[PDB]
Design a binder for this molecule. Structure first.
Ligand SMILES: N#Cc1ccc([C@H]2[C@@H](O)CCCc3cncn32)c(-c2ccccc2)c1
Ligand SMILES: [Zn+2]
Lengths: 271, 404, 173, 293, 224, 225, 193, 213
């Protein structure tokens, strides 16, 4: 088992691929592509993606390996430290055809990942689903199966700024404390709903879930976050660095204003 | 009678507006020659309580011959009541006579040697005449002089801790004597309170004043500035580039005992400094700033001990006394203890082996207290910038500035 | 907190001064409070500004000024000696027995912050206590007093977002 | 629907290119629409280069007086005018492969990064773009500043089109302020009048809209658990060094066009960014560190 | 023979001008084979002047580059083995013997009419540079094996490195109880904060002073 | 039989020739062969797993460890405890390593082959990387006790492995302390905030699925209306 | 030492057609000058050295060169001890032996201090097989030449190596900003002279 | 699941079989929460009878710690070594719930551990079972716990959850209110500055146009 960190750029790649093909052929079609990134120890990080050429022969999709290798050399020219991590497609639950394509991809690398997107979905969470291939001996036969992996959204500051810019699609203090405001609103809504569920379980309106309340108590125990003395020293270090920067900037601003006043004074009173 | 008609016209003009006419009529003096001057002093205070009876009290105090009044008792009582109930901006129309009356009262109190008796009066007169707290009037000098002669330095502190941004013109008047007197007397008041940081500032502002002649206040302020700079700092601070050429051409040669004291102070020899003090003891006592020269003698020892912290991590008491010329480990220990108590040094004493140990500043800038200090400095800078911007904008809308 | 208010009232009453001169009890209270607050410059200036006739007719001011002189010379044994050499009608005694407590706390803080090791006799002289009393008193704070060598070992003892918004508003106008 | 822009009309594109109205008008192209995906791609490429400039191409199409970017791909290019001439083979191979996988859009411009010194065209950029509008017309030049994107929390991007050699435009000198370092201020001042900045707007399709809306349900964590004071720390020290040099020059001018005002503006920008970072830290401390018993 | 004479004359002129570094630089470039100046300089004097001036002013890298690892000057130091030994013991951090030989040759150097005015300051500079180079590799010296590495005693050592520390050449503190020279590097953050706060304080003070001056010039206050 | 008999002989020869990872790959390949008599597939899988001793740390071996870890048939093997600790970077104690060596065979059990035992050295270096993730810093005679080696040997191995870039840290000889990664306060604060928010998200998601609609959507509408 | 190495190589390759008993000495001098510059890396692996290095007229010299490139103090001093009468006998070899040893003791020491932040001087003495006096002398020489970035605590007898690098670029920038503000602030005020 | 398997094996069992299954639950590795099995009425019926102690033992493994078993060793059934190790793990978890930096002395006293090697071995064991995640600071003698599982909660421990969540919600509301107020104040400052600047410019223009007459 591995831990996967997924970059939103990959999701945008897949969504744009699907949108382009659906608009080009009129009807929504299934798109197939590659996922690349970095594997360090047990931690996989998927950070980019490119489209893959596939041909449907009879009733089976075959991945054009020569095109894959030319594109592999191409992305090796630009991304020198990125490796082929797996493949992606679009649809619902993994189909038997996905097993065939995954077996084909396994001829490229040992343990590929499998990403699946659901552009036509009804639930309220991200339709991205990640799987890994396992081989099971059932009734004396080696069959491929998909084991779902739990992924987190990898954070890069530039990526976060870009995602916020493309998601929001719009004084400096006000513009700054609107990105803070939205995240605090989401946190407040989630914590408030958890509190309402706990209060409902206490007085009694929902079945008593031992696991949910145990996680709620653990979450309560997680506060305060890192209230150690070294943290306080570091926090006040940062506060005092910013305070000194503010003091110096204020001194510069006052010097500029004093210069303007001195110029006006010399002009008015003849000196 | 002329006095009755003048009182009637004064009453008519008051509560009818037109304060310019009232000031013009009061300016028509010379008819206040009758020595019944007190009968009309209490016939006009019912309405517009006190804008009149100010030229009356002025002409009473400028009677040359001592206020005949019992000592002056009665005139002092009337003036105190007038200052107590002059209802503010009414007397600001004629603000040269108000300041003149304050000067007359101050001179009368100084002559009869009871300045404290009028210390609290001028406090009422200062804030009832100035537009705002950051406005320098000629009664500031009187208040400082009264708080100096009668040694009550605390009443003058609210009037010295405020930085002056404007100076009252007072219908002409206001010669440079008031400015120099205020800053010299404030410097001496701060010196008595051992606020050398602000005493040096006041003395510097006294010498900075543009001048084409030699002022006695300027020379005394320069001579005390040298001593205060030798106490607060280890050297004489450089005067601003814009100081008038008179101070460097006349006042500097007239102050040679103090320059020689500074020169012998730059060499860290307490015995040489004591010899210089004994040599020029006639000038230091004549200038009446002896005991401030002895403070330089005391501060040279502290400067020498403070220099040991820049070289030594740990020193003995005996050899420290040898280095700073104290002649005894006990005196060195008492000096270290006093400097530790005063905060002038970070050190510890260990008399198991008789050792001073010099530490670093324990202030590492990682606490909310330093955050509060930086915020206070930021607020002071922000209000400084706000004042500068206000003056800038008031110059901009000046028709004379727009024309050029 | 009553000491500060009494000091302010005494200062105001001396400023009123129907004649420029205050009553001798007010002078004594003001001098005692100046000594209490460890403000020696104003205490000395009050001593000079007190009329000599009041000093001659009121010998208590001599005792208060002797205590002040002991404070000026940083002479703690002299301070304790001169404090316990006078009494009056319970208007300076409340502010002068409180002066002794403040002096004792001041001496304790000075010894704690200035000495890494101090002889028991010197420490006792500083705190104005018998030597054995001073050594025994430092028990629950752990001053590691030693016998034979007689050496004590003193031990050394919101609205931020609004402010930052103010700073940015000032800087950006 | 918002998916109309993603449909490629080859016949209309050929007709528009044959008409080429931009050869007559000199300020014909006024708008630049960049997709969310392309903008993200160039942002990650610019950030991946660190303090070194990076460059790639971007594909798209022209509609009316608007240049629209569908995608962008990096180039193995590492002073040099038309540095993409060293990577023509990579460009052609990528174009062929993209056409193989249904990327019907042709090259519309080139993007490059300006790490930490604003979005504009230098002397080399002006020459490259002027050469690009002679042969590869229509062409637009996008400059991205990833370091200032991090520092200001705002995408620093700018699309530009140059002017042909021997054409003086009608002034157009509002000169919206941009902090240019002391080393790059001369080139910016010299070449500022040889190009104009297109108005940059962004677009996304329905699927990207839905996916971003659903991703924000779990992406608010990164907003509330990130420190700006630590990531763009070396940028602030460089800004302070440049500002101190500017203050030195302004003081020299005082001893002798109001360099002190520009230095004050730069100091205000840097200090405001620092105080914004501190405000974020204070908000985080209030949210997570003050629930003690 | 012409370039060597010009170099020697320039070095002598800049030595008499009390510019020892330039004198060393010009006298080091002289050629041994072309050195015959009965009216200007003997070959031994060139070696002594160059060696002493270089030891006084050259740092370690320059000394190695120009005096120790230079094949041109090796001949000159062959004339005067004492100067070569002094230079090489200075390089090899053997200060006791180097200073002992310097003191031994002091008397002979004081009879040289062209170097006698400079012997005192050259020796002072050499000793100061030796004291700096001794403590450079140390975070905590001993003030013993150091008072022995030089001719002085421990008390004279404290007297020397107290003025060395005061002048800013050695950044250290002497603990006189245990007699150990500790090295204090810097508190860069605290120094930055202190200097910034001090600058702000002086800025506010002089801004208030200038505002008062503006009020004074506004009202035309002057002494006549 | 056919050609699988050749594959077994080839893998055995690769074992003898110390061709570790290739032999493991071949054994894994014939472990999935359907035509073999079941339990022999288990023997092939066990032989492939027994290349935890025969292996050089790197990328090709780590992928093999991951492949064997993703096998449900490896839980029946006695070496599984060695595998799970080697893949998950956990400390391998003396008794378990001794059992693993006991169930080995003499040629795989190369006595010295480098000086000390070649397998024991790799295990010691593996336990030292795995101890760098459980400790901020560790003394000698405690790191040595943890790896069952003398404190001097532990210091020597840690120092040699730090310089070669295989592990981050530094040695303080005066205190006898190996210091691992620092983990400064503010990045840790950000990580802990992110973990707490992840817990909030997970609790919200779990509440919405054990009580779908009902309280979940009722309260979602209540707070949003 | 570079020109000496090439000159000795040319002499060795040109002295084959002449006197026999001074062919091996020239090879010894060549390999001495090769490893004296500690950058030649020219062991007996050279193909032109086959006729005179494969034949074991001298063998201790080849082992000496191998130990020198391997930075092995123990092996280097063992060849200088057990294999006698063919290394120390030559006056030309001996006068550069001490330079060679110090060349390797410096290179071993550099590798030894790399993972440490504080290392005992007796430890370095035991590792370099030399007593603490010359250990401190070598450390002083290396620190002076900027070869080793550390300092010697003489009272506790230990080397402290500079391993922590607090961010000081920010504070230098703040200091420059403060100095420029100090200079600029005066310049503005002087305009109201 | 693993606890759910044991619950299905205790649907009808009672008496000695229930105590045997309780011992198996307390011994089987991987299960550190027992509230689902404890809430069973069949299990809770053991409060009366000879097996009552067994039930109380379960209440020790769900809500109590190792010191609670040391003081009641006589009343409780004799614990196995595996059950003692599990109880020590749960004590470590309980300590980590209230403090995120546990001193070594507290762990030594509470877990009744002999020396430092044994205690750190036990802590490493606890980390490997994923019930806690943290690092051991030997020099400062601390265990900085980053994560710990939530132990079982009594019906009186839900009030603390409500209290903490309500305090967190109030803090979030206060932060949002402060952010909105600061945004309003910044906008007001900017608009006032612009208004004053434009008014000064208008006054200057008026003066200039008056000066032309
Ligand atoms: N086509 C064209 C082109 C033109 C210029 C550059 C570089 C180059 O000049 C060096 C710094 C000045 C500069 C500002 N913006 C770009 N540059 C580059 C370039 C871009 C990335 C990597 C290497 C070269 C390409
Ligand atoms: Zn560019």
């Amino acid at each position: 088992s591995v831990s996967v960190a997924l970059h939103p750029l990959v999701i945008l790649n897949i969504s744009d691929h699907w949108i382009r093909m659906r608009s080009q052929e009129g009807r929504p079609v299934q798109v197939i592509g590659a996922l690349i990134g970095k594997q360090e120890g047990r931690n996989i990080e998927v950070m980019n993606s490119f489209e893959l050429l596939s041909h449907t022969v009879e009733e089976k999709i075959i991945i054009d390996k020569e095109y894959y290798y030319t594109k592999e050399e191409q992305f090796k020219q630009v991304f020198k430290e990125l490796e082929f991590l797996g493949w992606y497609t679009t649809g619902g639950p993994p189909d038997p055809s996905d097993i065939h394509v995954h077996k084909q991809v396994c001829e490229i690398i040992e343990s590929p990942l499998f990403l699946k997107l659901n552009p036509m979905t009804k639930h309220t969470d991200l339709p991205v689903s990640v799987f890994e291939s396992v081989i099971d001996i059932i009734n004396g036969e080696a069959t491929m199966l998909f084991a779902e992996l739990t992924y987190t959204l990898a954070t890069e500051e530039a990526e976060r700024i870009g995602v916020d810019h493309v998601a929001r699609m719009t004084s400096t203090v006000a513009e700054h404390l609107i990105a803070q405001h939205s995240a605090i609103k989401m946190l407040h809504s989630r914590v408030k709903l958890i509190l309402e569920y706990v209060k409902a379980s206490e007085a009694g309106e929902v079945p008593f879930n031992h696991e949910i309340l145990r996680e709620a108590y653990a979450l309560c125990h997680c506060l305060p976050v890192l209230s150690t003395d070294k943290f306080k020293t570091d926090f006040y270090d940062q506060c005092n660095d910013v305070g000194l920067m503010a003091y110096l900037g204020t001194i510069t601003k006052t010097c500029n204003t004093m210069n303007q006043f001195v110029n006006k004074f010399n002009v008015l009173y003849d000196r | 009678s002329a006095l009755e008609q003048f009182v009637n016209s004064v009453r008519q003009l008051s509560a009818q507006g037109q304060m310019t006419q009232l000031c013009e009529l009061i300016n028509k003096s010379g008819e206040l020659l009758a020595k019944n001057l007190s009968h009309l002093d209490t016939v006009l205070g019912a309405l517009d309580v006190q804008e009149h009876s100010l030229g009356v009290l002025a002409v009473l105090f400028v009677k040359f011959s001592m206020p005949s009044v019992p000592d002056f008792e009665t005139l002092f009582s009337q003036v105190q009541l007038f200052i107590s109930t002059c209802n503010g901006e009414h007397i600001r129309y004629a603000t040269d006579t108000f300041a003149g009356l304050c000067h007359q009262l101050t001179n009368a109190l100084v002559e009869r040697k009871q300045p404290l008796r009028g210390i609290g009066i001028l406090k009422q007169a200062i804030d009832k005449m100035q537009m705002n707290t950051n406005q320098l009037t000629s009664i500031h000098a009187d208040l400082c002089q009264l708080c100096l002669l009668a040694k009550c330095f605390k009443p003058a502190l609210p009037y010295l801790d405020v930085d002056m941004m404007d100076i009252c013109k007072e219908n002409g008047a206001y010669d440079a004597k008031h400015f120099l007197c205020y800053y010299y007397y404030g410097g001496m008041i701060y010196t008595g309170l051992k606020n050398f940081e602000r005493a040096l500032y006041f003395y510097e502002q006294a010498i900075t004043t543009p001048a084409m002649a030699v002022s006695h206040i300027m020379l005394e302020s320069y001579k005390k500035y040298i001593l205060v700079s030798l106490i607060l700092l280890g050297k004489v601070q450089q005067l601003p580039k814009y100081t008038s050429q008179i101070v460097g051409r006349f006042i500097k040669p007239l102050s040679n005992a103090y320059h020689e004291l500074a020169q012998v102070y730059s060499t860290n020899n307490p015995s040489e400094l004591r010899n210089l003090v004994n040599k020029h003891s006639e000038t230091f006592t004549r200038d009446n700033n002896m005991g401030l020269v002895k403070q330089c003698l005391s501060s040279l020892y502290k400067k020498n001990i403070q220099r040991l912290t820049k070289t030594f991590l740990t020193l003995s008491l005996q050899d420290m006394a040898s280095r700073v010329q104290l002649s005894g480990p006990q005196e060195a220990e008492k000096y270290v203890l006093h400097m530790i108590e005063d905060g002038e040094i970070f050190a510890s004493i260990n008399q198991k082996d008789g050792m001073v140990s010099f530490h670093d500043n324990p202030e590492k800038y990682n606490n909310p207290a330093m955050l509060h200090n930086i915020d206070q400095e930021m607020l002071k800078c922000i209000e400084l910038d706000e004042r500068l911007k206000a003056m800038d904008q008031e110059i901009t809308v000046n028709p004379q500035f727009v024309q050029k | 907190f009553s000491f500060k208010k009494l000091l302010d009232q005494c200062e105001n009453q001396e400023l009123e001064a129907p004649g420029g001169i205050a009553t001798p009890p007010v002078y004594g209270q003001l001098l005692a409070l100046y000594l209490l607050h460890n403000d020696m410059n104003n205490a000395r200036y009050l001593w000079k500004r007190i009329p000599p006739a009041i000093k001659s007719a009121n010998s208590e001011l001599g005792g208060i000024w002797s205590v002040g002189q002991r404070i000026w010379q940083r002479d703690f044994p002299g301070i304790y000696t001169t404090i316990n050499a006078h009494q009056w009608s319970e208007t300076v005694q409340p502010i002068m027995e409180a002066l002794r407590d403040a002096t004792r706390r001041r001496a304790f803080a000075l010894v704690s912050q200035a000495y890494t090791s101090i002889i028991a006799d010197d420490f006792a002289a500083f705190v104005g206590l018998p030597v054995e009393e001073a050594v025994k008193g430092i028990l629950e704070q752990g001053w590691q007093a030693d016998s034979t060598t007689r050496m004590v070992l003193p031990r050394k003892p919101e609205q931020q977002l609004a402010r930052l918004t103010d700073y940015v508003a000032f800087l950006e106008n | 629907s918002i998916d109309e822009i993603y449909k490629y009309d080859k016949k209309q594109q050929q007709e528009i290119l044959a008409a080429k109205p931009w050869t007559k008008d000199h300020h014909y192209f006024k708008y630049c629409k960049i997709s969310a995906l392309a903008l993200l791609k160039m942002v990650m490429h610019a950030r991946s280069g660190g303090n070194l400039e990076v460059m790639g191409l971007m594909l798209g199409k022209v509609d009316g007086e608007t240049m629209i970017i569908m995608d962008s791909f990096a180039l193995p290019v590492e002073t040099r005018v038309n540095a993409q001439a060293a990577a023509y083979e990579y460009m052609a191979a990528y174009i062929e492969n993209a056409k193989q996988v249904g990327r019907l859009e042709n090259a519309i411009g080139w993007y490059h990064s300006h790490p930490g010194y604003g979005c504009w065209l230098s002397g080399i950029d002006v020459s490259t773009q002027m050469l690009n509008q002679q042969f590869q017309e229509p062409f637009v030049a996008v400059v991205i500043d990833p370091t200032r994107t991090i520092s200001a929390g705002k995408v620093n991007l700018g699309a530009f089109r140059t002017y042909p050699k021997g054409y003086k435009p009608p002034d157009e000198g509002p000169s919206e302020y941009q902090t240019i370092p002391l080393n790059k201020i001369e080139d910016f001042g010299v070449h500022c009048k040889q190009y104009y900045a297109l108005e940059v707007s962004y677009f996304k399709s329905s699927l990207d809209r839905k996916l971003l809306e659903l991703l924000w349900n779990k992406y608010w964590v990164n907003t509330l658990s990130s420190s700006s004071l630590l990531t763009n720390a070396d940028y602030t020290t460089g800004q302070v060094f440049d500002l101190s040099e500017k203050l030195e020059q302004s003081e020299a001018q005082l001893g002798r066009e109001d360099k002190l005002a520009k230095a004050t503006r730069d100091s205000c920008k840097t200090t405001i960014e620092a105080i914004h970072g501190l405000m974020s830290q204070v908000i985080k401390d209030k949210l997570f560190n003050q629930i003690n018993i | 023979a012409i370039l060597t004479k010009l170099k020697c004359a320039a070095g002598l002129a800049e030595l008499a001008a009390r510019k020892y570094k330039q004198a060393a630089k010009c006298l080091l470039l002289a050629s041994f084979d072309h050195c015959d100046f009965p009216e200007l300089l003997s070959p031994s004097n060139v070696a002594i002047y160059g060696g002493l001036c270089a030891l006084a002013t050259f740092d370690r890298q320059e000394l190695q580059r120009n005096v120790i690892s230079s094949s041109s000057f090796k001949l000159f130091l062959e004339l005067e083995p004492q100067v070569r030994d002094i230079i090489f013991k200075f390089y090899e951090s053997k200060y006791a013997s180097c200073l002992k030989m310097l003191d031994e040759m002091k008397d002979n150097l004081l009879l040289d009419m062209y170097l006698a005015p400079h012997v005192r300051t050259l020796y002072t500079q050499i000793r100061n540079r030796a004291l700096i180079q001794y403590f450079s590799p140390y975070v905590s010296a001993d003030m013993h094996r150091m008072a022995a590495a030089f001719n002085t005693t421990v008390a004279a050592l404290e007297d020397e490195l107290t003025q060395l520390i005061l002048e800013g050449l050695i950044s250290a503190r002497v603990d006189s109880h245990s007699k150990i020279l500790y090295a204090r590097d810097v508190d860069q953050r605290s120094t930055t904060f202190e200097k910034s706060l001090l600058m702000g304080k002086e800025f506010q003070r002089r801004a208030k002073a200038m505002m008062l001056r503006a009020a004074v010039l506004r009202n035309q206050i002057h002494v006549k | 039989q056919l050609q699988i008999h050749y594959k077994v002989c080839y893998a055995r020869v690769l074992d003898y020739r110390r061709k570790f990872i290739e032999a493991a790959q071949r054994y894994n390949e014939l472990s999935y062969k359907t035509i073999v008599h079941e339990s022999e597939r288990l023997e092939a899988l066990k032989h492939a797993l027994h290349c935890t001793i025969l292996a050089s740390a790197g990328q090709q071996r780590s992928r093999m460890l991951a492949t064997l870890f993703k096998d449900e048939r490896c839980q029946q093997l006695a070496a599984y405890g060695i595998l799970e600790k080697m893949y998950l970077d956990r400390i391998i104690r003396g008794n378990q390593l001794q059992e693993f060596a006991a169930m080995l065979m003499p040629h795989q059990k190369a006595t010295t082959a480098d000086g000390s035992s070649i397998l024991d050295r790799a295990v010691i270096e593996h336990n030292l990387l795995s101890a760098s993730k459980l400790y901020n810093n560790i003394t000698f005679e405690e790191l040595g006790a943890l790896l069952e080696i003398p404190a001097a040997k532990a210091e020597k191995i840690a120092s040699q492995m730090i310089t070669e870039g295989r592990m981050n840290g530094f040695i303080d000889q005066i205190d006898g302390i190996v210091h691992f990664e620092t983990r400064e306060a503010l990045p840790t604060w950000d990580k802990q905030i992110q973990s707490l928010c992840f817990q909030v998200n997970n609790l919200l998601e779990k509440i919405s699925q054990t009580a779908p609609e009902w309280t979940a959507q009722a309260m979602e509408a209540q707070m949003a209306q | 030492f570079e020109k000496a190495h090439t000159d000795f190589f040319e002499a060795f390759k040109n002295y084959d057609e002449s006197g026999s008993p001074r062919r091996t000495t020239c090879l010894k001098y060549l390999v001495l000058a090769n490893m004296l510059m500690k950058s030649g890396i020219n062991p007996f692996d050279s193909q032109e050295a086959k006729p005179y290095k494969n034949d074991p007229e001298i063998l201790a010299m080849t082992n000496l060169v191998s130990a020198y490139q391997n930075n092995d103090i123990t092996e280097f001093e063992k060849i200088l001890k057990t294999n006698h009468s063919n290394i120390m006998d030559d006056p030309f070899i001996r006068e550069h032996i001490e330079e060679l040893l110090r060349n390797i003791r410096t290179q071993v020491l550099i590798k030894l201090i790399k993972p440490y932040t504080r290392i005992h001087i007796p430890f370095i003495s035991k590792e370099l097989n030399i007593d603490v006096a010359d250990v401190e002398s070598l450390l002083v020489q290396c620190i002076l030449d900027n070869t080793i970035h550390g300092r010697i605590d003489q009272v506790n007898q230990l080397l402290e190596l500079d391993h922590q690098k607090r961010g000081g670029a920010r504070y230098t920038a703040l200091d420059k900003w403060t100095n420029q503000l100090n200079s600029l602030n005066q310049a503005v005020v002087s305009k109201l002279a | 699941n693993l606890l759910e398997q044991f619950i299905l094996l205790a649907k009808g069992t009672s008496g000695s079989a229930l105590t045997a299954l309780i011992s198996q639950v307390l011994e089987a590795p991987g299960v550190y929460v027992f509230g689902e099995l404890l809430e069973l009425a069949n299990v809770q019926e053991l409060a009366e009878g000879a097996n009552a102690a067994y039930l109380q033992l379960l209440n020790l493994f769900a809500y109590g710690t190792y010191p609670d078993y040391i003081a009641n060793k006589e009343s409780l059934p004799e614990l196995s070594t595996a059950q003692q190790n599990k109880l020590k793990h749960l004590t470590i978890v309980s300590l980590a719930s209230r403090m995120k930096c546990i001193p070594y002395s507290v762990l030594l006293k509470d877990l009744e551990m002999r020396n430092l090697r044994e205690l750190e071995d036990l802590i490493i064991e606890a980390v490997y079972t994923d019930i806690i995640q943290g690092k051991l600071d030997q020099r400062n003698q601390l265990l900085e716990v980053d994560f710990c599982i939530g132990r079982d909660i009594r019906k009186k421990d839900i009030n603390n959850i409500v209290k903490t969540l309500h305090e967190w919600c109030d803090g979030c509301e206060a932060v949002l209110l402060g952010i909105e107020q600061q945004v309003l104040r910044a906008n007001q400052y900017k608009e006032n500055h612009n208004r004053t600047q434009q008014q000064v410019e208008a006054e200057v223009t008026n003066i200039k146009k008056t000066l032309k007459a």
